[PDB]
């Protein structure tokens, strides 16, 4: 019964080390049945990420036009499973950057529902 907006917050928001991704991928239920291979966390306020839905309108990867690019760079952590990672012992490399995010927005209130990319 999780909404698309709630799922985006669970997978992609960290509004709060080398082991960050190992710990975060676990606590967000992204290693439950399989190791989710790639995931990005946004290290910004929920308000600042929701505001992206009023910024630069762009096409999404899938061809819809409800995508938005952040005008500002944001603090993000990229998590990517190692070559040698095997479930249920899921292993991630943690990479920090300052990049624009692209999100899909839907619904009322009009908030992020899908992490399209970082640029
Ligand atoms: Cl969707
Ligand atoms: N930027
Ligand atoms: N971060
Ligand atoms: N997403
Ligand atoms: Pt951070
Ligand atoms: Pt952080
Ligand atoms: Pt930029
Ligand atoms: Pt989606
Ligand atoms: Pt996602
Ligand atoms: Pt997707």
From Swiss-Prot:
Residues 1-13 have a biased composition (Basic and acidic residues). One of its GO terms (molecular function) is lyase activity. Substrate binds at residues 7, 10, 36-40, 61, 80. Glycans are attached at residue 29. Its main location: secreted. Keywords: Disulfide bond, Endonuclease, Glycoprotein, Hydrolase, Lyase, Nuclease, Secreted. It is found in: Secreted. The active site is at 12 (proton acceptor), 114 (proton donor). Disulfide bonds join 21-79, 35-90, 53-105, 60-67. SUPFAM superfamilies: RNase A-like (SSF54076). Gene3D superfamilies: Ribonuclease A-like domain. Residues 1-17 are annotated as: Disordered. Pancreas. Its EC number is 4.6.1.18. GO terms for biological process: defense response to Gram-positive bacterium. InterPro entries: RNaseA (IPR001427), RNaseA-like_dom_sf (IPR036816), RNaseA_AS (IPR023411), RNaseA_domain (IPR023412). It catalyses: an [RNA] containing cytidine + H2O = an [RNA]-3'-cytidine-3'-phosphate + a 5'-hydroxy-ribonucleotide-3'-[RNA]; an [RNA] containing uridine + H2O = an [RNA]-3'-uridine-3'-phosphate + a 5'-hydroxy-ribonucleotide-3'-[RNA]. It is an enzyme of class 4 (lyase). Endonuclease that catalyzes the cleavage of RNA on the 3' side of pyrimidine nucleotides. Acts on single-stranded and double-stranded RNA. Belongs to the pancreatic ribonuclease family. Monomer. Interacts with and forms tight 1:1 complexes with RNH1. Dimerization of two such complexes may occur. Interaction with RNH1 inhibits this protein. This is Ribonuclease pancreatic. It comes from Bison bison. The lineage of its organism: Eukaryota, Metazoa, Chordata, Craniata, Vertebrata. The gene is RNASE1.
